[PDB]
Amino acid sequence: IVKETDNIPIYENLGAGGTAEVTPVYLCGAQALAVAYAKRWKTVTEEFDYGDKYGVAVDGIYGVRKIIFGSGSGDTDDLKDHGVVTGFFATTGAATVAAAAAAEN
């Protein structure tokens, strides 16, 4: 089941000749991602400056991680993506990520 998610990044100047745009496609089965929730999203309100300023805040304690497991002698050895297949393809679309941010660190 292929799903159109508009917020998949398009990396710039990572294609042929440093001009084409490269985009990822993620094929996922069972046990692909793990989300830990220590505290769900909550809202709080506060007053400042003798009740002159009003502040609203949203708070959460959580973490999202791609499940990867080792495949070598050590526990954390050669790591493989447990349940995710990544494909890199070329596109003509405008890049969501600039060349500076997309280049290797």
């Binding site: 159109e4 508009d6 003509t92 679309g93 405008a94």
Partner: protein, 52 residues
């Protein structure tokens, strides 16, 4: 992010120069042009709200 020219040609500097790139043979309105316009609608940063 909201303007489509022909088959997807033209730079982002001059409107007259972009319109001067439209020829009668390959820059007509077809399914490819409609799909490109839908892509422009769905990929613009200030997302276009769909009718339904």
């Amino acid at each position: 992010d909201r303007v489509y020219f022909g088959a997807g040609v033209g730079s982002g500097t001059d409107l007259s120069a972009d319109l001067a790139q439209l020829d009668t043979s390959a820059d007509l309105f077809n399914v490819a042009a409609l799909d490109g316009m839908i892509l422009k609608a769905k990929t613009c940063n200030p997302k276009i709200r769909p009718m339904r």
